[PDB]
């Protein structure tokens, strides 16, 4: 029960290290709320055709049903304020993502 992450033109092939640098600054709020938790983690999904930032937050069927949970490595934030590292570790097909 977390908002979907904004891939923003970044394909994350299974078992393929990837970096995500969204231009929006609202996902960092979610990144700071997870720091007090014992185990740090993030989930990974892929976006469908006709990318739209308003559709990622408005409806939840746009995203495909497959998903890939994985563990966070380390934050850097060299240039932007949202420099997360992503990985394709555990593929999953959630019964219902909504």
């Amino acid at each position: 029960h977390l908002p979907l992450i904004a891939i923003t033109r970044n394909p994350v092939f299974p078992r393929f290290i990837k970096i995500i640098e969204v231009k929006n600054k609202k996902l960092v709020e979610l990144l700071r709320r997870k720091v007090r938790l014992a185990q740090p983690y993030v989930g990974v999904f892929l976006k469908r055709d006709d990318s739209n930032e308003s559709d990622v937050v408005e409806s939840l069927d746009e995203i495909y049903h497959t998903g890939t949970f994985a563990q966070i490595h380390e934050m850097q934030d060299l240039g932007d304020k949202l420099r997360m590292i992503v990985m394709g570790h555990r593929r999953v097909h959630i019964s219902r993502q909504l």
Partner: protein, 48 residues
């Protein structure tokens, strides 16, 4: 990471890393993900 070392204890992960080199659009990858059987995805990958 070679195939002659027999250290590829989880082949699916290596095959996914190898299939990532394909230039097919992401949607096509999702279509490959719909496949459950292993030879179906292998044949689709070869076709790709």
């Amino acid at each position: 990471m070679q195939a002659g070392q027999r250290v590829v204890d989880n082949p699916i992960y290596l095959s996914d890393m190898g299939a990532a080199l394909t230039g097919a659009e992401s949607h096509e990858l999702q279509d490959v993900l719909e496949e459950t059987n292993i030879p179906k995805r292998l044949y689709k990958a070869l076709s790709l």
